[PDB]
Symmetry: C4
Subunit: 332 residues, 4 copies
């Protein structure tokens, strides 16, 4: 594999069509899904030359820990849909690559089993029908060693996934929500979580500048600027199009991550040049899992690491902080 697109071809071959569609699809007409790619393709980097590259490092510090790249595995529910080892395969590869892995509320292996793999696990929260149960998942995650709570704030309910409707898609009987034996979140829910944990709370799914500012005021340790991979509001702006304005409004008050359509180390460089602290990567990780299990995810992360180091050095950046100081130009 020499690009992330090699892995998509491989995953399309192996997966059942309805599972590939559950993975690939977006809501509505898929306008926001396509726009995430369009938006990144319009960004061009203005590289710098002739800088010292003797010790190029792709490492960052985030939420108290070093990470090997400015990247984490995005939360993706039900990873046993894609490979029998599901989340354990992905978490082991992420641990070995030094990349944080986001354990999902709707994981198909329990959060404690995935946390026991080690590494830097974060935990993604969906707000449940009652405050006490929500907070119990948060406490389980914290007890299990998760390092951050990634509270998804863009899913008061699931979007209209027309591929899934047309396919009549349902979970196979062999895939379950292993953390179990949902409700719209509000700013009150954020405060309940913030009061219940010492872990940093990261709000995933922020697009309005005013919501990024309120996230900082609310005590969030980070936000993920994101339209949920085009799976929630069809017509929501891409996160990459709001990122620069959000980074300026936040003034360093929290970490600002972005996701949606990151498909290469050059895309990671674009996101960092627009001001991101780090990116999330979703679908490509599942392509690698589907294609070749744990080893596939390892190969994907090795390729991304090579592409990030290559792009940074070609752009004159010995560190991720230098990459954040790059300028960009929109093209056509």
């Amino acid at each position: 594999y020499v690009s992330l697109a090699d892995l998509e071809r491989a995953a399309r071959d192996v997966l059942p069509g309805e599972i590939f569609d559950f993975l690939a699809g977006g809501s509505g007409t898929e306008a926001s899904l396509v726009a995430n790619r369009t938006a990144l393709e319009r960004v061009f980097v203005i590289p710098r030359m002739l800088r010292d590259l003797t010790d190029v490092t792709t490492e960052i510090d985030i939420f108290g820990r070093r990470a090997a790249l400015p990247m984490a595995v995005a939360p993706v529910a039900y990873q046993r849909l894609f490979h029998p080892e599901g989340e354990l395969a992905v978490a082991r590869a992420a641990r070995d690559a030094g990349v944080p892995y986001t354990i999902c509320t709707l994981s198909s292996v329990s959060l404690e089993e995935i946390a026991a793999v080690g590494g830097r696990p974060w935990f993604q929260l969906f707000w449940l029908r009652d405050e006490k149960r929500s907070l119990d998942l948060v406490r389980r995650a914290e007890d299990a060693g998760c390092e951050a709570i990634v509270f998804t704030v863009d899913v008061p309910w699931m979007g209209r996934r027309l591929r899934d409707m047309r396919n009549g898609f349902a979970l196979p009987e062999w895939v379950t929500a292993a953390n179990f034996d949902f409700a719209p979140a509000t700013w009150e829910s954020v405060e309940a979580v913030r009061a219940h944990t010492d872990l940093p709370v990261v709000l995933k799914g922020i697009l309005a500048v005013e919501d990024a500012r309120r996230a900082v005021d609310a005590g969030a340790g980070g936000i993920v600027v994101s339209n949920h991979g085009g799976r929630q509001l069809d017509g929501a702006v891409p996160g990459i199009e709001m990122l620069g304005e959000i980074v300026a409004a936040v003034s360093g008050g929290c970490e600002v991550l972005v996701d949606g359509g990151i498909r290469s180390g050059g895309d990671v460089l674009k996101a960092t040049a627009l001001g991101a602290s780090a990116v999330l990567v979703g679908r490509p990780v599942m392509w690698a899992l589907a294609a070749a299990g744990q080893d596939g995810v390892r190969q994907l992360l090795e390729l991304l690491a090579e592409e990030v180091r290559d792009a940074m050095g070609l752009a004159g950046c010995e560190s991720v902080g230098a990459a954040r100081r790059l300028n960009t130009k929109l093209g056509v």
Copy 2:
């Protein structure tokens, strides 16, 4: 049916080609017809998160009455072209969905019969060869219980519909203008109508900011910002591209509706975020009528209601007024 595009496929199968072309076509090269869709596809919404969605309502108050959605059925002449029950099928479905239905001057069932269905009928006026006859249709509509006069102001004559010319299209003998046993309108005609009725007068086909302002000064209760579905001047700007500037110039002085290419609840959300009070929907209603009669229109309106509620909630809007306060960003 899971999108409005499902209904177009269904209507193309059933209708005779020349009738499908009368419905689908525009004037000239169809540049304005295509632009209505291009323009909406360029608009992206910036959704808000974490707001109270306990009682999301899609209802509005307009021209004195509650409507279940910020939407009305646009005037479309000669609906018996599409189904034998014609206007009565559409009006019954609109009534049952709580959506206003616009009765046309060129309806193929008399305005009194369609008004007797109940619901919230509006009446669309074409200016006739003489003031007294025009005003008689207005008085008939008012006597029959219509709630608003939708005066079409963009048809001094019919545009050049090249599909119809190439097809040699003419009305079948079984379709007639049932209100009967035309001239360019002017601002004088508007005043004659305004003086002849206590109903709100809504000018349909306004695109210039100065004409929206004059409409308010003339005592209009509303305007529809519209290029007539691309059927009148080929090269006329889409209404959606003038809407924001018109809403700002009107300063709340009248209701500002828009039409042209609304094909989903997400498009309704875009129109409201640009400042519309409500939209009109034309061709999709006729697709549903052609595909499945009254039940088809009911299914279309149920689908649109679900899509509007979904889009509003995903965008953090518990009411249409909140949706009007959303910001937008143009994309590519």
Copy 3:
């Protein structure tokens, strides 16, 4: 025929390929040829409603004479390439339609024969190897009753027409330059012409704002804002993209015409809304001549007249002057 595009299809059928290519082609990669169409397609008109249309007139006064439309036939060399009656067929149709016809220096029938047809003949000048001969053609044109001298200023030499090179195109022996038994023009050549005639001198091929201003200072009665149909500099900006800036800089000091890609009455409306006094139309007139001779040109001009009247009225314009006061908006 219901559009000008019907005539292009007809002309492609009848003409030999190399003659169709001489007509259709541009220089280089044909980027400027395509851009003339792209540019017009990007312009949208903001029409006005509710104005008095009791006496819509498409007439203008230009260079001292009434014309039936804001349009003249562009200079096109060697019209016997397209039909045996060549220029006489086109000039007769233009006369009968009330449209000025531009007689070319390289006409395949003598300028005196074409002038004898009557109508409103203008005369297009190419600057010859010597001032005295150039001025003799000007004097011949004036003696023959031509009303304006259209001095082509964008042909110091012919552009690189790769279709013609690839085809090895040459004039058939049956087509000749009938005014005969060339050099780069300069501002000195313009003054020599201006001093030699009382007719208005119109500089065809102006694109720079500074050249439009100098044309007025030099005593030109008009300019044609034009990239020569994409046949001269490949990469020259379309005239329609410079027109508004040129109209503002000229401040009424001369007539400002435009050409390049006018293919409908709606395109004439766009040009007038951007400030043109009138347009030239080139290739479509030759399509009609090739398809059906004099009667073909008559049908083309009747169609254009109908399309111009339709577009003007739909845009609320009772006169060409009102159309020049329309606003426009660029789209995608």
Copy 4:
């Protein structure tokens, strides 16, 4: 051959696929390779008319010598890949056309042999693992009569050329680096070169305005604004998009060349109108070499000379300096 595109078709026929891919390809997704062409296609020239063209000259003075066109042959490694005479064929054609030829560090014929051909040889430097060896190549080039040192500053290492990876491309045994029996460059390396030679030092691969300014401060005699033909950072902005801003920031302090996608004399005109002193041309020269050896390169340079003279005169420019004063407009 009537366009440079004729030569590409010819070269694709003759070369082995993997060698054609080594020549044609870029890094990553080839976004920057495509953007170099997109960017030039968006630029339109505003030509001037009616100027004196009695003695149009395409000549420039650069780095102390007259050149026949505002163009030099870009450095392209390993030219024996394309034809058995390799660099000697290209250098002989460049000499005979009066065009500077850039001898590469990785030439497949020694720099002294290519310099002995005569003409105006420049020498391109890659920074080697140690300062003394780098400086020895510089001294060899100077001793051999090269006129300028073109220091490549955008290759701390080679980009990720996925065509080459997929093809498993390697140099045939019959092609070698004939100057031999590499390390990231820095501003310190530039100063070491500048101190070691009296020749002008030209930094190739500058895109950031701040790096152009620093190049002047560092004593560079020129820069080449360039993304390395899309072969280095995938996503680097095209040089043509940074050129105008760089020319303004440099204020005449050094020569400012550009490369990337120049494929016609009209493209040379666009580059000069945006402010370039001269362009480099890479791939087309190798197409001509592959198609027909020395004579092919001669034909390419004759065609480019004709296209540059044609474009300049059609734009009203008697000299390259006048072409630099042309204005441009971006189109779509």
